Amino acid sequence: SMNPPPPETSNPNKPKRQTNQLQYLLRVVLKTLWKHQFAWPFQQPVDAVKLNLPDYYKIIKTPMDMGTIKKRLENNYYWNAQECIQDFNTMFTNCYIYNKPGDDIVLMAEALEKLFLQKINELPTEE
Ligand SMILES: COc1ccc(-c2cn(C)c(=O)c3cc(C(=O)N4CCN(S(C)(=O)=O)CC4)sc23)cc1OC
């Protein structure tokens, strides 16, 4: 069995910014979700080998996880907040697309997503 290469977290020729909205996405959004009791399935790329999900990457073609997002934020990979927000939304959507409706992992994603939406609702104005 095999996993794909993980998503990109470093690219020296991608232009980058450090901004107050991106700072909020690390300090408030990522940190809030990371510490949650249901974060663990989402803290690293899905390991389809260890988890015995041989069809995962047959179904999910845009993988994303909070480990990747954390690295992107810490290594200032993004230009804007919308790129990062999109990564969170991709992660949640993948979970809902792959899993059977009602499963434990879906409930976990929903709990994280509720907090995500609450924090993004108060994304600060650009300075
Ligand atoms: C380090 O531990 C974990 C990491 C990731 C997941 C995990 C993450 N995400 C995002 C998922 O979508 C996901 C689905 C999983 C799973 O075990 N499933 C759903 C798919 N089926 S199946 C039969 O359709 O392949 C098996 C059960 S584990 C997991 C679960 C872990 O341990 C419980």
Centre a 10 Å sphere on the Cβ of residue 25 and count the other Cβ atoms it contains.
25
| Alpha carbon distance 80, 88 (integer Å) | 14
CA of 119 to the centre of ligand 1 (A): 26
Ligand 1 atom closest to the Cα of residue 52 is: 25
| DSSP secondary structure code for residue 25 in this structure | I
Residue 43 neighbours by CB distance under 10 Å: 14
- Count of CB atoms within 10 A of residue 90's CB? 18
Burial of residue 30, with CB atoms counted within 10 A of its CB: 0-12 exposed, 13-18 middle, 19 or more buried? buried
> How far apart are the C-alpha atoms of 59 and 97, rounded to whole Å?
8
Q: How far apart are CA 95 and CA 42, in angstroms?
A: 9
Pocket, ligand 1, Cβ cutoff 6 A: 41-42, 46, 51, 53, 95, 98-99, 105
Q: Looking at beta carbons, which pairs linking 32-38 to residues 24 or more positions away fall under 8 Å?
A: 32/115, 32/119, 33/66, 33/112, 33/115, 33/116, 34/66, 34/70, 36/111, 36/112, 36/115, 38/107, 38/108, 38/109, 38/111, 38/112
Alpha-carbon gap, residue 103 to 86, rounded angstroms: 24
Experimental method: X-ray
Tell me the domains of the chain and their CATH numbers. Answer: 19-123 (1.20.920.10)
